Amino acid sequence: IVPQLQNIVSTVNLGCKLDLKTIALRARNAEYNPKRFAAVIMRIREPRTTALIFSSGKMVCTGAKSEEQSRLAARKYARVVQKLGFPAKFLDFKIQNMVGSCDVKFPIRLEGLVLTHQQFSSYEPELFPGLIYRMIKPRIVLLIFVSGKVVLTGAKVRAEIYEAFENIYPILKGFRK
Amino acid sequence: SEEQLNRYEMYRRSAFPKAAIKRLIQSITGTSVSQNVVIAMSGISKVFVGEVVEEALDVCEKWGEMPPLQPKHMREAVRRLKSKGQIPNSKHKKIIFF
Amino acid sequence: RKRLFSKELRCMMYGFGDDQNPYTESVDILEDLVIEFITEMTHKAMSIGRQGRVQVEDIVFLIRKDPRKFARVKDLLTMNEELKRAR
């Protein structure tokens, strides 16, 4: 089994202060709702990706499914800000989070899993139909469902997701229904 | 064992549905409630059911009967809980000084 | 009135040691008790605190005396906040 990435959240400093009204009026697919939130929400189409551009020149880029695709979408957002007229430098690009999900191909019985690992797992069925297991060494949060689908979140690199899944796989096989 | 693991599964996974209690409370208030009210009110009522069944199985163990719960152990459960003030009735103006 | 808690309450009685197959009359008594408890709590909550509004704060003051119920409300609220933070 391999976990495929579903969501990459990155951040990039453009270095130049922006007034948001000209970007909202000139650029396409740009949404600005200040009485609601203080950023410009611009979406692109080729890589299905969304950017929140802030007035201090920092940009949050969400939605891509690899590191190179997130970097390429961030470059596209920087050049569409640039060609409007602002002098925009690609100062620092950092990926805040990487999210992956996988299916372990059997039903899982969660009550023994909270019974034997109650130090790291918080499970409340009514609030959410999933078990939050916190891995202490990778620093990942895993939502483990009864149907067999596991969602790994809270990672910076890919190898952390891979090592967390290889860590939590023998426990899940030990607790098969 | 193999029944204790099934019983512990039903002790945790069972809940009253939030789509009906939000319909039930709003028929008493008149206008609207919030999600953090319905989350708490669905949780207290599970403790209150667990206050009765854990005490109605004390009535059945006191008398000479088995685990199936007849209503005799359930009217007696509300009687013993009310004498310890656990069951609140806001229609009986009580008076302690006589 | 119909029964809005017929199948849900049978899982809960099994959760506290009754049987896998309880009696319909016992399930009916439990459902009536739950509806009465919810109604009483809602009236007292409307009286206490903001008149005509039932809030979490009012519900918490009402359940303060009973230890088992107060602990459950606090745990559920804290866990809800934690799950929202994780999301």
Binding site: - | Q70, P71 | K7, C11
Partner: peptide, 26 residues
């Protein structure tokens, strides 16, 4: 989408195991 379909699977097994036959009492 994962939260929407998995919520009803905690309750679907709560209608297959418990309460198979319906009883009554005098």
């Amino acid at each position: 989408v994962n939260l929407s379909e998995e919520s009803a699977r905690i309750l679907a097994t709560n209608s297959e195991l418990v309460g198979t036959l319906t009883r009554s009492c005098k």
